[PDB]
Design a protein around this ligand. Structure first.
Ligand code: 6CF
Ligand code: CL
Ligand code: CL
Ligand code: CL
Ligand code: CL
Ligand code: MG
Ligand code: MG
Ligand code: NA
Ligand code: NA
Length: 326
DNA sequence: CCGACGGCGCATCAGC
DNA sequence: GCTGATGCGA
DNA sequence: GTCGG
């Protein structure tokens, strides 16, 4: 909140470039600048001072000076008035509707929540669910509720097979007071980078959670990733809790550390760390950290026994989860 | 100046 | 049916 | 839009 005005402006500019301009790199550039400014420990006084931060160039510097002076950004004033842009922006807020589909719908005259509801037939499954719980998905999740959800998931997973280990990551693991959703990393000894000694490992868990009515809907479901909806049980006379998005990722047990690092985030932190890895001659994904030969092709997986091991390979001091919220 | 910018899972599609 | 490309998402 | 070579 120290430089809230400027970061909000940058984030809005970022969303515009992504949803309307479909210029993903401009999107990341803005988000990075927004992130770097967000942790700057001083109340920014000028674009010049801001340009000293990495990721902030001449363009954002000018925009910051404009914002600091007037208290707004004309470029944004306009974007906010353009009915097409605003419509595209809105629709992309429905889970399942990206920049392409949004532009396509608007070109069909479908540009509001009301239009989407009467044209439900024109939506694929994911979009149908995103629209159904549109309101709820906008709501944040108090950490207290996250704790209750964790308890339900861990206990139900334990019931399926005591050998399962379920770890809630995402912003929760980073210590956030509230989260946009629940992200669950799941492991089981019967599934490693060496073999899949038992099939349906993820299925069984998803099934158990549906059986006790915690999981209510499914957006997508594969062998290692589940994307759906859940809801905490409410007491008698108590109004129901909002429905929530839940992601579950089954990762090879022998690759837990690269897995938990990836799933802990943040997303911008992962980008920056993976970008730093490249500059150091390494490539990192949710399974391994591999070296890059002179040729450029990824080499063999390096031995990892802790999140810190990954940080060492790239010559970075270890950072606790609470300090990776970029 | 200009090429890189993180990496991948699932759903859906076109082309065979 | 397969692969590969795309959209959308983590 | 920003960066580094
Ligand atoms: N583009 C991305 C997106 C995600 N992630 C990893 C790193 C992320 O931490 C993790 C979770 O994705 P999430 O989509 O639940 C998230 F990011 F919003 P979270 O941090 O959990 O914040 P919230 O509370 O609001 O959910 O996936 C990533 O690596 N790249
Ligand atoms: Cl771009
Ligand atoms: Cl503004
Ligand atoms: Cl690992
Ligand atoms: Cl790999
Ligand atoms: Mg999350
Ligand atoms: Mg998530
Ligand atoms: Na800079
Ligand atoms: Na969307």
């Amino acid at each position: 909140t120290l430089n809230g005005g400027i970061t909000d402006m940058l984030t809005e500019l970022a969303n515009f470039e992504k949803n309307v301009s479909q210029a993903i790199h401009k999107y990341n550039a803005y988000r990075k600048a927004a992130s770097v400014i967000a942790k700057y420990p001083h109340k920014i006084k000028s674009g010049a001072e801001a340009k000293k931060l990495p990721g902030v160039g001449t363009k954002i510097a000018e925009k910051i000076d404009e914002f600091l002076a007037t208290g707004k950004l004309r470029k944004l004033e306009k974007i906010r008035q353009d009915d097409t842009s605003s419509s595209i922006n809105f629709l992309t807020r429905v889970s399942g509707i990206g920049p392409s589909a949004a532009r396509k719908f608007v070109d069909e005259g479908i540009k509001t929540l009301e239009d989407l509801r009467k044209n439900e037939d024109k939506l694929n499954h994911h979009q149908r669910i995103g629209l159904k719980y549109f309101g709820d998905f906008e709501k944040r999740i108090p950490r207290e509720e996250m704790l209750q959800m964790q308890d339900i998931v861990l206990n139900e997973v334990k019931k399926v097979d005591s050998e399962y280990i379920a770890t809630v990551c995402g912003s929760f693991r980073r210590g956030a007071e509230s989260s946009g959703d629940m992200d669950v990393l799941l492991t089981h000894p019967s599934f490693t980078s060496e073999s899949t000694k038992q099939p349906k490992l993820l299925h069984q868990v998803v099934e158990q959670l549906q059986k006790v009515h915690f999981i209510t809907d499914t957006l997508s479901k594969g062998e290692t990733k589940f994307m759906g909806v859940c809801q905490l049980p409410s007491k008698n006379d108590e109004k129901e809790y909002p429905h929530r998005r839940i992601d579950i990722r089954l990762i090879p047990k022998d690759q837990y550390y690269c897995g938990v690092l990836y799933f802990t985030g943040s997303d911008i932190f992962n980008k920056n760390m993976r970008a730093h890895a490249l500059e150091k001659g390494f490539t990192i994904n949710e399974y391994t950290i591999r070296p890059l030969g002179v040729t450029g092709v990824a080499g063999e997986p390096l031995p990892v026994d802790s999140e810190k091991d990954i940080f060492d390979y790239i010559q970075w001091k270890y950072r606790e989860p609470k300090d990776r919220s970029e």
